[PDB]
Every structure is written in C-alpha cells, then in structure tokens.
C-alpha cells in the first residue's frame, strides 16, 4: 500500500489527506527515539528500539513540555505559536508528507521549529507541510526536539545531563532521515534542513558539529544564526544556572548526581515554573537553557570554527525579516503595547536599550545609545521606538547573521541571502510592529495558498515564488531555475555582498545588508566592552 | 591737534589715512610694554616707561618671533599669514584707528590674532582696522603678544619662566586700553575683545581668568574657545616640553635657571628651528608652547571654572566656519594637495584620523573612525577627504567651541552663535578645502569693501551686515539694531547661517557629532 511503509524501525500507516483540490500522504507521530521519561531526562536520546506491528501514523504526535504563552489569552497572533496538543516529555517524534503518487528519489527537506530552544512545536498550523509538499513535490519532514530545561540543562563532566540532547534529539531525527526518507519516496543524500530563529540556529549548529555534517547536503536558515548572543552559553553559565536552577527548587546542590536526581524527581511544570529565574540579568531575548559550547558537539569556540572554516562547506539561503525585534520589545520592554503606537519616551528608550544588550557595560550601553539616536530630535517617540525596534533586530539577529554569512561565505561553495521585508495584508499584530520574528514562515509553507485564510493575490504569488526559490535550492544548491526566465537571485560573494528583498514587488538587488550598524555590532562594541 | 594725542605713558602722534574715497586718523606701533628682550625673554611683561617727546605712530611695528610658513613661496593663500614687518623680540605694541572727527567716547573693539599661539601679527592685511573703525564708527585696536616659546614657555614654579607671559601681554595691552583709549574717544567702559583661532581662545580666558575680567566689556569668539584641545596644556606637559627644547639645544638642564639662562643665550631663530620637535605625537592641529593650566592666570581646570560658573557674566558672540579643518589636512596629512581634488585613499584616512587624534588610543581610534565612515562606500575618496575634513574640524573647533556655547549660557547674559559657510568667489585654495579656517576675518574686517579686492556686491553687503552684527553687538550686547539673529538659549540652542542668502535659524550645531566629541570619546578615553 501507498500508506503503508515498513521502516528500519517497524511499519508506519499513515493517512490520505487533503490539499487544495488534490491529494498527499502523511505520515504523522512517527517516533525516532526513546521517550527520554525518567532516569531519560536530560540524559542524550537512545534509538526508538523497533516495535511489532503497524504504528498508527495518522494523528500528529504530543508537543514537548514547554513555556506556554498566555500575555494574550485568545489572540491568535500569540496563541499561533503555543502547543495545539497535549504536552510530555514523551514528545520525540516526526512527521513525513508525501506526494502521492511516491515519488522515486525526490529532494527533501527537514523542518526544525524554533522557539528561542524553550518553546516549539512541530504541529503548529503554520508548519503544516502539505502544502508545499504538493505544490513543490518534495518530501517534507517535520521533526521535533526537546526545549527549556528537558533539552539543554547542562552540567558539563556530567554524563547524565552533558547538555546540547536538544541538539542531539534533531540529530538523532536526522540520522533516521538517513536511514528510513528512502522508503517514502525520498533522496538521503539530498536533504535540505531549514528552521527559523532557535530552529535557524539549529541548522547552522549542525552546519558546524562534525557530528551532524554527514547527515544532510544543505541548509536554509531563516532569522537565526549560530553565533547570535542567545543561540548559545559557556559550560561555566550553562553549569551556574543548572545549579541556580535546582537553588531556586531546593535541591541538594552538594553533587551533580543528587541536583540532577533532585530535578528528575520535579514534574515538568516544576522546572518550568521557575525556568525564567535563572537568566543573569533582567532582559529580553534571552533565554534559560540553551546550546553549550562544549567541547563535543562543537569542537572549539564557534568564532574559531568559522575563522578555520571547520565546518561543513556546502551551499546555504539564509535571512531575516525587516522588524525582528518588535515582538521581544512588546513582550519585555516599557512603553511597548499591541493596542497602541506605541512612542517611546526617552526615559524608556533608555530601559529599552540596557534591557536590549544585558551584557554590556555603561560604555557599552553609551555606544548603543549614540548609534540609534537621533540627536537633533532626541525626543521623538516614534523614532525611539524604531530605533529600539532595531537594536534588537540588529544585535540578536541580522547581524550575527551578517557575521555568519560573511564568514561563511569565505568557504562555502554558494550563498543566497535575502531581507524578507512584506508585512501581511491579514496581520493582526499592531502596524508598529512591522515585518515580526517569524512571519516569513507562513509563505515559506503555502498559507497564502489556501483562500478561506483571506491573503490577496500578489501574497500568493510571493508564497509561490518563495517555496519554488526554497525546493529549487533544496534540489540543486540554486534557489534559481537554470535558464529560467524569472529575474535572478545572485549568489552573495565576499566581494559584492549582494542580496534581494523579497515582498510582492520586482526583485530588487542590493548590497551588504545593514553593514554601518552591523560594523558597530561585530567589530566595535564587541572590542569595546573587551577593553572594559 | 586731532592726530597728536597725550596718553598716560607719553605723547603720541597719529597718521591721517584714506579709507574708502574719505579718511580717518590712524595711530600705529603704540608700545604698551617694554621690550621683552635679553633677561626680559620668559618673563611676565612689564609696563613701558613713561616716554618725554613725541612718539611717532605713523608706521606698523616689528611682528613677534615666530615660525614661518614656507610651504608655498608666493603664494597669497598662505603669505597673507606671515610676518609682513621685521620680526623682532621687540614687538609688544599696538595699533588705533579712530573715526575722523575723533568721536566722542564711542564704543572700543580690541583685535587678538590668531595662529596657535606659535605665530601671528597685528600688522597683517587682513587686519587693517580703517574699514571697520570708519564704516560702523567704533575705536578698533588691534595689540600683540608673544608666540611660540617666547610667549609660552612653561616652568612652573619659576618667575622667570612662569608661562601664560603671551596671555599677559594681551592683558596689559587691554589695560593700557582700560587707561587710555578714553584719550582717542574710546569709551573704556564699553570694550569688546574679538579674536580668531588662537585669538578666539585667548578672548575666552580673559572671560575665565580674574585679572582679565575687568578690563573688557563684552566679547567675540571666532573658531576659537578657551577649552579647545590644542589651546593649553597641564604644567607638567609645559614643563616637560620646556626641558626637551633645552635638550634639543644641548642646555644644561639641572636647573630651571641653568636651563632659562641658555635659552636666553640663544638667537631667536634657534629656538624657533627646533620649537616643532618637542611635540609629544605626530600630529597635526597641535602646538608646542601654549597657555598652562597654572592655578593662576586659570584659578582651576578649564571645565571646574566653567561648571561652577567662575567666569565674567555678560553677553557674548561667537561662532565657526563650515571647513575648519581642511588647511591643517593639506599642511601635516597624507593624500593632500592644493593643486588637486585630494580624494584620499583608505590607507591615508586611517593614518589621518590617528594624525587628528594623536592623544587617542586604539579603540578610541576605531570609534572615531567609524563615526565618519559611510560602509556602503568606504572607498569612496571624496567621502574619505570630507570625512577627514569634517574629523579635524569638529574636534579641534566646532564641538570644543559648542561645549564653550552651552556652558557658558548657563550663566551667561546673552549668547549668539552663528555658523559661517560662505565661500568666497575670489578665493585662491582649491574648492575641496570649502569656507577655510580664517576666512570669515576678511569679512569681519570689510575687506569686500575695497573694490580692487574683485569681490562680488553679495560679498560686500554680506561683509556689510557681518560688521554690523559685530559693532552693534559690541555696542549693546545684541547684534540686532531696534530678520532678527536670535539669541542662544540651553533650551532652544537657535544659530543662524552666515552667508549671501537670507538669514537661516537653526538649532544644535552639530549636535549629533559634539555628542560624541563632547561626551562620547571624552569617557571612552577616561575608561580605556
Ligand atoms: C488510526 O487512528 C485514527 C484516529 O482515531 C483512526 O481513524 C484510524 O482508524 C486508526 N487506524 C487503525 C486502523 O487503527
Ligand atoms: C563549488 O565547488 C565546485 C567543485 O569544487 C566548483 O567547481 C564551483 O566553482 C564551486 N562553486 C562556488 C559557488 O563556490
Ligand atoms: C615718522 O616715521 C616715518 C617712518 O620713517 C617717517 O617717514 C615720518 O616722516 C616720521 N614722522 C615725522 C615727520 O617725524
Ligand atoms: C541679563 O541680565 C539682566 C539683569 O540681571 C536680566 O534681567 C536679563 O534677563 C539677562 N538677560 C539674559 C539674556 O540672560
């Protein structure tokens, strides 16, 4: 049967559903590894170990223990992002969509949600992948990985909670990718991984673990780098804030052994709870437990690695949106609020700036201010909230991303960089807010497809055009059509820096995407706060 | 006679002077000191001996010592600086055009050159004060002072070479003036001092400095204010370069006597020949011997005094040109040219700014270097040429002199800023160097007045209304006459334009840029 697929695992049924007057199959909730319950937790993930029968793949699979957002009860523009299944930490399982008929060796492409590495889910409605399964003919997967805590509480020397199971857990997904894809129609050797944010991280940590180089041929990554400032800790703040986790529990924090045996005792929501308690500073855009450099997954520093070019040398499309801060500012800073303008004083701008960059010092601070602020109109609330706006966006996400490509591009053999700068005709977060963190997402994936959700014309013709840019790439390492006819995307060099925006209207080229902000991010401040 | 005059120290005797078809009387080389010459040299001034006879003051007298710039021989751009008399150590005298019929104690306008305090002369072309004294009928002086190390030579501790004697020379001349202008109509209770550059900063410390306050009435800062970078140094850098002229000379140095009797030993020239090599950096827009903060002529710091308001309160008029930078580029910075566009290539840049700001570490060089680069087109020559232009600018006179401005207004009575940007149509440098450093002096003094000059009618009526702005302000305090200058307050920060077009209000100088000059660097520095 079409449905029916016998893995290395055991077989998997899944089911027919629907997509836009046409048909494709879905396998869903198929695990990949242990449920990682018990003395599993935090622990790296063990092989799902074959079962006997037929595993019913037609339901999607529990979300992970997580954070759940409840700022806005009701709102769709937050709700969209919380889990729309039941969680546990029985939550280690991915979903296959299939054109049907099977295809014989077509490309794939495997999503990994982000979520800053503490929230995530892989059955959201804006990762349902039938369509652009369909409409691209790709075998598209869906993969899942523990967050928060459960995926990257990390005490390094520790074998029972070595850190970076999160990352493994995608791996793991990766690695049974390799060795089951083939069976539903899909190429091992020609798998694309992409993700947004934490997920966009993700894949450029895989693009550099050795351990995770073999098991893919390309990447995508879509507002995340693996160098940006909250993508990643130190043993030593990973292991303070493991240990300030279990204070904030009254654990015994005499030994690694009873602070961990102490935390695999909690029930999830325990852990949650005070999750929030351990960050070093009062911030945003910072996140608990997250990936750590330790000296495993990621051989050395991650500045190191891309200087040597130790990493995996391949093609890459990456890029970001034109308001990636707005909606960490509306969450965390003074002044911000989804039901007005939002004008910030300059006493807030102030409290924006210090919550924006934690880590800096009072000159640092200076430096910041003096950068984004508009000194002839000082007190200008609309530009005090933009310029806010783009502190954020700037430190936290398009320029470590700049780093990265740059760095990148230095070895690889193909970049593709693009500023995603459309704001949705159908948005229902405030104007301020412009181009918000993950919005790109819902082209990516064909949303704009379907009529019942109200998109206009031209944003199904920039949804069409972006998975077609996504698949061609994931196909042939060129998000162009050879000798196509459509205007073309060139490829990003370390000479012309060049990059396209993508939105509704023509393409249009441009080069070295925000480099007199992103000098003063990667060069000077980081020299500056070096110094003292 | 209304040419021979009795002052107080002895009777002189004036010139009858055409001025624009018309005449008016001119006193020139009047002595207000006596000649600070032989054990004389370093020390503070002493007032001139009473003469008996009459003393002719119908020609210019001697310039100071000081460097000369040979650059460019012939050229009218850079010879209009230099010393156009005899130089000499004899030189402490000062010169006085009064509006003929003498009026009757009518307003007195004091002139201070400029020239970092190393160079300049009252005898100059662009200084001749008939046009001026004659088209807004005022009483303009114009005095001297000694320059380089005969002026500014720094032990402190000793009274024979104690420092500030430059400074003190204007005092005197301005005492002298307090004494006996009063003889030639001039009103001495209504006195403005005007200077540029180095004169601009010198009218700035007589305002901080207690024995100077009293002597003048109202004053004029032009490119120039007291707490400029390059416009003083501490006594121990005073002292240090001091000691390394002695070394540079082979002079006994184990004694500031020993050390003062060899320099007195020495020619004038010889002290001149080596006066450059005792800067401390490689640099440009910075001088060997200049004003010390003594704890004397200056009570405290600079930035204590104007803090806590310790400075003579009244109305003051001050300003900067649009390219203040620009001629110290082509002197001391590579990629430079008077016969050439001058783009500058990124490598000169780099070595440019660390030329403009010698004193600045690495990191404080990063900053100001990414202050002013475009990184969209950092290759970019012009961009590169502006940048640079605008780095030495900024820092040396616009933010120094805007800090000045806002200090000064909290306790000032009246302040007007104007920002100059207008360049002239007959100017001899090349366009890249824009509205030069110094050149709004020929309009302060209606140069655009003499038709020979080739100026154009918009120049003249331009030089018109600046002369104008600057009489009625130096005669009420405020340079509107009853389109209205407005006045400078910390609130609204309001400047004009001055040049051809209609009068522009504006607000916040350069404030984006001074932030960072001002405030910005100032604690990198401090920090790192
Ligand atoms: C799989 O589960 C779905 C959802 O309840 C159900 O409709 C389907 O019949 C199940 N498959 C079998 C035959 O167990
Ligand atoms: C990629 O590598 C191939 C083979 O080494 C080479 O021919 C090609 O020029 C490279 N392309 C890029 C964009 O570096
Ligand atoms: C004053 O000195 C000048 C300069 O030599 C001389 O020409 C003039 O005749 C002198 N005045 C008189 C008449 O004493
Ligand atoms: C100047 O001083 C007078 C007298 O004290 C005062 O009334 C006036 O407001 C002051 N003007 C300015 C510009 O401060």
Same mark, same amino acid.
């Given at each position: ?298 051989? +050395? ?170 698949? +061609? ?60």
């Amino acid at each position: 049967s079409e449905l029916l697929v016998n893995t290395k695992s055991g077989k998997v049924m899944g089911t027919r559903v629907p997509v836009l007057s046409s048909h494709i199959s879905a396998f869903l909730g198929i695990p990949f590894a242990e449920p990682p319950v018990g003395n599993m937790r935090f622990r790296r993930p063990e092989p799902k170990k074959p079962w006997s029968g037929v595993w019913n793949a037609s339901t999607y699979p529990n979300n992970c223990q997580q954070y759940v957002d409840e700022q806005f009860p009701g709102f769709s523009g937050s709700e969209m992002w919380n889990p729309n299944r039941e969680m546990s930490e029985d939550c280690l399982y991915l979903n296959i969509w299939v054109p049907s008929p099977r295809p014989k060796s077509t490309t794939v492409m495997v999503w990994i949600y982000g979520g800053g590495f503490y929230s995530g889910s892989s059955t959201l409605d804006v990762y349902n992948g039938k369509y652009l399964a369909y409409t691209e003919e790709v075998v598209l997967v869906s993969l899942s990985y523990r967050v928060g805590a459960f995926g990257f509480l990390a005490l390094h020397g520790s074998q029972e909670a070595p850190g970076n199971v999160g990352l493994l857990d995608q791996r793991m997904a990766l690695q049974w990718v390799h060795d089951n894809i083939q069976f539903f129609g899909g190429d091992p050797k020609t798998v694309t991984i992409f993700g947004e944010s934490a997920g966009g991280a993700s894949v450029g940590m895989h693009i550099l673990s050795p351990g995770s180089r073999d098991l893919f041929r390309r990447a995508i990554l879509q507002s995340g780098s693996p160098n940006c400032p909250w993508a990643s800790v130190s043993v030593a703040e990973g292991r303070r804030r493991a240990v300030e986790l279990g204070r904030n529990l009254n654990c015994n924090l005499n030994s690694d052994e009873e602070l961990i045996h102490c935390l695999r005792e909690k029930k999830p929501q325990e852990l949650i709870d005070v999750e929030w308690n351990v960050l070093p500073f009062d911030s945003i855009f910072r996140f608990s437990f997250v990936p750590v450099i330790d000296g495993e997954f990621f051989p +050395t520093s991650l500045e190191s690695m891309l200087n040597s070019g130790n990493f995996k040398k391949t093609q890459i499309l990456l890029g970001v949106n034109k308001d990636e801060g707005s909606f960490f500012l509306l969450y965390g800073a003074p002044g911000f609020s989804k039901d007005s303008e939002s004008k910030i004083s300059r006493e807030d701008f102030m409290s924006g700036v210090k919550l924006s960059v934690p880590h800096a010092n009072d000159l640092g601070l200076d430096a910041v201010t003096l950068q984004y602020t508009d000194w002839m109109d000082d007190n200008n609330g609309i530009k005090n909230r933009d310029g806010l706006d783009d502190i954020v966006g700037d430190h936290n996400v398009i320029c470590p991303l700049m780093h990265f490509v740059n760095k990148y591009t230095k070895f690889g053999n193909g970049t593709y960089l693009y500023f995603f700068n459309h704001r949705a005709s159908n948005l229902v977060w405030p104007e301020w807010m412009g181009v918000i963190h993950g919005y790109e997402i819902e082209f990516v994936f064909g949303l704009p497809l379907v009529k019942e959700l109200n998109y206009t014309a031209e944003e199904e013709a920039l949804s069409r055009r972006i998975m077609h840019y996504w698949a +061609t790439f994931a196909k042939t390492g060129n998000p162009n059509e050879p000798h196509s006819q459509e205007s073309k995307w060139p490829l990003f060099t370390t000479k012309e820096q060049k990059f396209i925006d993508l939105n509704t209207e023509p393409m249009k080229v441009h080069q070295r995407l925000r480099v007199q902000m992103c000098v003063f991010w990667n060069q000077f401040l980081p020299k500056l706060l070096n110094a003292t």
